[PDB]
Scaffold this active site. Structure first.
Site, short mmCIF file in Angstrom:
data_model
loop_
_atom_site.label_atom_id
_atom_site.label_comp_id
_atom_site.label_asym_id
_atom_site.label_seq_id
_atom_site.Cartn_x
_atom_site.Cartn_y
_atom_site.Cartn_z
N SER A 79 5.04 2.54 7.60
CA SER A 79 4.66 1.40 6.62
C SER A 79 5.95 0.95 5.95
CB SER A 79 3.55 1.33 5.82
OG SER A 79 3.93 2.49 4.89
N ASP B 277 0.09 -7.36 2.11
CA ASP B 277 0.65 -6.12 2.14
C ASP B 277 2.09 -6.22 1.92
OD1 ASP B 277 0.52 -3.50 1.82
OD2 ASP B 277 0.03 -3.06 3.93
N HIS C 86 0.76 -1.25 -0.12
CA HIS C 86 0.09 0.12 0.07
C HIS C 86 0.95 1.06 -0.02
CE1 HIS C 86 0.42 0.02 4.47
NE2 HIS C 86 0.30 1.55 4.53
N1 LIG Z 1 -1.34 2.09 14.36
C1 LIG Z 1 -0.35 1.68 13.32
N2 LIG Z 1 0.42 0.64 13.74
N3 LIG Z 1 -0.67 1.93 12.16
C2 LIG Z 1 0.19 1.64 11.10
C3 LIG Z 1 -0.36 2.24 9.84
C4 LIG Z 1 0.69 2.22 8.89
C5 LIG Z 1 0.08 2.97 7.51
N4 LIG Z 1 -0.97 2.25 6.85
C6 LIG Z 1 -2.01 2.78 6.82
O1 LIG Z 1 -2.25 3.94 7.01
C7 LIG Z 1 -3.21 1.77 6.04
C8 LIG Z 1 -3.48 2.33 4.70
C9 LIG Z 1 -5.07 2.33 4.37
C10 LIG Z 1 -5.46 2.72 6.07
N5 LIG Z 1 -4.35 1.93 6.62
C11 LIG Z 1 -4.52 1.69 8.02
O2 LIG Z 1 -3.64 1.36 8.72
C12 LIG Z 1 -5.72 1.84 8.79
N6 LIG Z 1 -6.00 0.35 9.62
C13 LIG Z 1 -7.30 1.83 7.85
C14 LIG Z 1 -7.37 0.67 7.07
C15 LIG Z 1 -7.05 -0.58 7.34
C16 LIG Z 1 -7.19 -1.80 6.71
C17 LIG Z 1 -7.57 -1.77 5.22
C18 LIG Z 1 -8.07 -0.27 4.96
C19 LIG Z 1 -7.58 0.69 5.85
C20 LIG Z 1 1.22 3.41 6.56
O3 LIG Z 1 1.61 2.84 5.66
C21 LIG Z 1 1.97 4.54 6.78
CL1 LIG Z 1 1.44 6.04 6.22
#
Ligand SMILES: N=C(N)NCCC[C@H](NC(=O)[C@@H]1CCCN1C(=O)[C@H](N)Cc1ccccc1)C(=O)CCl
Ligand SMILES: *[C@@H]1O[C@H](CO)[C@@H](O[C@@H]2O[C@H](CO)[C@@H](O[C@H]3O[C@H](CO[C@H]4O[C@H](CO)[C@@H](O)[C@H](O)[C@@H]4O)[C@@H](O)[C@H](O[C@H]4O[C@H](CO)[C@@H](O)[C@H](O)[C@@H]4O)[C@@H]3O)[C@H](O)[C@H]2NC(C)=O)[C@H](O)[C@H]1NC(C)=O
Ligand SMILES: *[C@@H]1O[C@H](CO)[C@@H](O)[C@H](O)[C@H]1NC(C)=O
EC number: 3.4.21.5
Lengths: 284, 259, 36
Positions: free
Chosen positions: B205, B99, B43
């Site tokens: 991420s 992912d 993603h």
């Molecule tokens: N508390 C955490 N550990 N969060 C980790 C998030 C990491 C972050 N990922 C995200 O922001 C991802 C993208 C879609 C929404 N999302 C999420 O982490 C949200 N759970 C929303 C979601 C989950 C599952 C499916 C769709 C949407 C990223 O790559 C970095 Cl900008």
């Protein structure tokens, strides 16, 4: 005991013959000399071959000795640094086949007006090139080709009007680019390429802001945080960026990074970003 | 990384920064697995729901960095992308199942005190280390708090962040979210009754979740920061892409072409 | 078919290689022991 000062630390020797009114090299200096300072002397003409011995010579300082003719003869396979700044050279010395180990070359403030064809042909393992203060007007396509490892390039204070569209080809490690104080009005198509430039200095130029000043328009936008204004040494130009220093027609209040191309072709190719808002908050 | 600490120099040599060329911004994190292969979250490159779709030419890869924003002289190496490979069965439409994405550097990178590859889990290592309670480690330059809503403190660090998190058992993981979980992901964090805090966050991420083998003393990348709901919220856990389970697809592309 | 870097992987120059441990890797190591 000679005429110079001989010192040390480790297995290196350092001889200092600065301001000693020499017209040639004070004979028989430690054979193990690594650093040699012949600054501010009277070496209107000098022969490299005269250094053939001292096989452990790595740094050579021939600045401020009003040299006009350098005789590239012998070889200094271990010479790495070479300062020929503040002299009377009118043609760039072909040091390729002579100084293979060179990594830093400063021919700043001389009387160069152009560069030979295979100018650097040979010194491919070079890291820094200083040509600030000469009167170069145009550059050769492939001037840096022989020097892919180049990290710093200084072309400030010259009479350049236009740069070779593909000057920066290769140069993956380039991080500092000084072009301030020239006579530049525009930047070629993809001049900066895909490479990231940490420190660029483009101020002090008469940038003609029209429809072909757009490439350089967005580039300034993206690299706004990478444009600095040269002040002097020891400053470490890592203090407060300043993209506004690049101005239209060198005209103060006319920053190029804020020039709407009004009636210009293709409404979406050059400077087509700035689509979303951002709210950053980092710390010390 | 939320509730983490400043990393030590060369502490996570395999840490990679996914940089966007224009505008110039840090998108995600990533990890080095060899002198020419990088591994991050899918993603980070593709997410139709937020019309995100980055092509090789839109990114750069900064390696061996410590500071989030300072160009670091002869420490970091900037590499370009030759090819991006996103898992062909990456589920962006629902829960980001699988992912993962591999990036192929245009040219090999030389290692240094700051740049080194992390090891991928094998049959026994995966089975041995992936147990609830065992601690992993996440590193990243991501946000220090939920930045989408007013909150006290800075948004992102000035130095790479590090945090150690316990692996959570599926049942606890599953019932902590309304999002559907698959075998291809795992969650980690401290429980409400454990006292300590810590979790990844947006911008983190791709970052790796690594564990050190008590057997051979080598660090393996067990996971990839994938998602979570909020950052360090009680009863909530971060979810990471299960690297081992996807080993067959990694092997298959990594080893696909000659050289 | 190839990548390059393994067999040497997971071993940090400034740490394992110098036989030095970072400030918190112990936290991880003590986690492999049943905590009751
Ligand atoms: N508390 C955490 N550990 N969060 C980790 C998030 C990491 C972050 N990922 C995200 O922001 C991802 C993208 C879609 C929404 N999302 C999420 O982490 C949200 N759970 C929303 C979601 C989950 C599952 C499916 C769709 C949407 C990223 O790559 C970095 Cl900008
Ligand atoms: C993420 O972004 C990518 C771009 O950033 C998306 O890919 C882009 O898709 C478009 C399709 O609309 C591509 O269009 C052009 O290329 C196709 C041919 O495709 C194949 O060859 C290309 C090389 O030439 C590759 O780049 C492609 O990946 C693919 O292998 C041409 O057929 C098109 O021509 C059409 O338009 C011209 C007018 O310009 C007409 O003359 C033709 O008759 C025809 O109608 C385009 O030239 C585009 O090249 C492609 N870009 C890239 C980088 O691949 C990608 O789809 C997106 N991912 C998702 C899920 O959204
Ligand atoms: C460069 O510009 C200076 C400054 O006006 C001028 O004195 C000099 O003659 C120019 N050099 C050339 C080669 O045109």
């Amino acid at each position: 005991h000679p005429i110079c000062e001989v010192s040390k630390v480790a297995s290196h020797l350092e001889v200092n013959c600065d301001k000693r009114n020499l017209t040639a090299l004070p004979p028989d200096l430690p054979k193990d000399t690594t650093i040699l300072h012949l600054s501010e002397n009277l070496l209107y003409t000098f022969s490299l071959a005269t250094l053939m011995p001292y096989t452990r010579l790595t740094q050579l300082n021939l600045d401020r000795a009003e040299l006009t003719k350098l005789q590239v003869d012998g070889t200094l396979p271990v010479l790495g640094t070479l300062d020929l700044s503040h002299n009377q050279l009118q043609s760039l010395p072909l040091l390729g086949q002579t100084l293979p180990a060179l990594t830093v070359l400063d021919v700043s403030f001389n009387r160069l007006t152009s560069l030979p064809l295979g100018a650097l042909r040979g010194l491919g393992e070079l890291q820094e090139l200083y040509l600030k203060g000469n009167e170069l007007k145009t550059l050769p396509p492939g001037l840096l080709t022989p020097t892919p490892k180049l990290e710093k390039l200084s072309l400030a204070n010259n009479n350049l009007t236009e740069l070779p569209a593909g000057l920066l080809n290769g140069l993956e490690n380039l991080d500092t680019l000084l072009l301030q104080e020239n006579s530049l009005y525009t930047i070629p198509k993809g001049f900066f390429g895909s490479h990231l430039l940490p420190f660029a200095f483009l101020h002090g130029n008469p940038w003609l802001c029209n429809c072909e000043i757009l490439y350089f328009r967005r580039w300034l936008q993206d690299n706004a945080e990478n444009v600095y204004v040269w002040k002097q040494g020891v400053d470490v130009k890592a203090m407060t960026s300043n993209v506004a220093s690049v101005q239209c027609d060198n005209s103060d209040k006319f920053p190029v990074y804020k020039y709407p191309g009004k009636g210009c072709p293709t409404l979406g190719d050059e400077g087509d970003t700035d689509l979303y808002d951002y709210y950053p908050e980092e710390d010390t | 990384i939320v509730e983490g600490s400043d990393a030590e120099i060369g502490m996570s040599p395999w840490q990679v920064m996914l940089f966007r060329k224009s505008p110039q911004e840090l998108l995600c994190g990533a990890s080095l697995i060899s002198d020419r292969w990088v591994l991050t979250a899918a993603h980070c490159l593709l997410y139709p729901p937020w019309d995100k779709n980055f092509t090789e030419n839109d990114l750069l890869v900064r390696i061996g960095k410590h500071s989030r924003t300072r160009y670091e002289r002869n420490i970091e190496k900037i590499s370009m992308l030759e090819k991006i490979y996103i898992h062909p069965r990456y589920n962006w439409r629902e829960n980001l199942d699988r992912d993962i994405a591999l990036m192929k550097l245009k040219k090999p990178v030389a290692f240094s005190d700051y740049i080194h590859p992390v090891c991928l889990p094998d049959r026994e290592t995966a089975a041995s280390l992936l147990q609830a309670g065992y601690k992993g480690r996440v590193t990243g330059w991501g946000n220090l708090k939920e930045t989408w809503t007013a909150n006290v403190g800075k948004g992102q660090p000035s130095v790479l962040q590090v945090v150690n998190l316990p692996i959570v058992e599926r049942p606890v993981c599953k019932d902590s979210t309304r999002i559907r979980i698959t075998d291809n992901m795992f969650c980690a964090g401290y429980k409400p009754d454990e006292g300590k805090r810590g979790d990844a966050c947006e911008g983190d991420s791709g970052g790796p979740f690594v564990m050190k083998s008590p057997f051979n003393n080598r660090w393996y990348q067990m996971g990839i920061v994938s998602w979570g709901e909020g950052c360090d919220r009680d009863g909530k856990y971060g979810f990471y892409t299960h690297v081992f389970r996807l080993k067959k697809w990694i092997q298959k592309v990594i080893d696909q072409f000659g050289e | 078919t190839f990548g390059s870097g393994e067999a040497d992987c997971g071993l940090r120059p400034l740490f394992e290689k110098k036989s030095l441990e970072d400030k918190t890797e112990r936290e991880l190591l003590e986690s492999y022991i049943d905590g009751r």
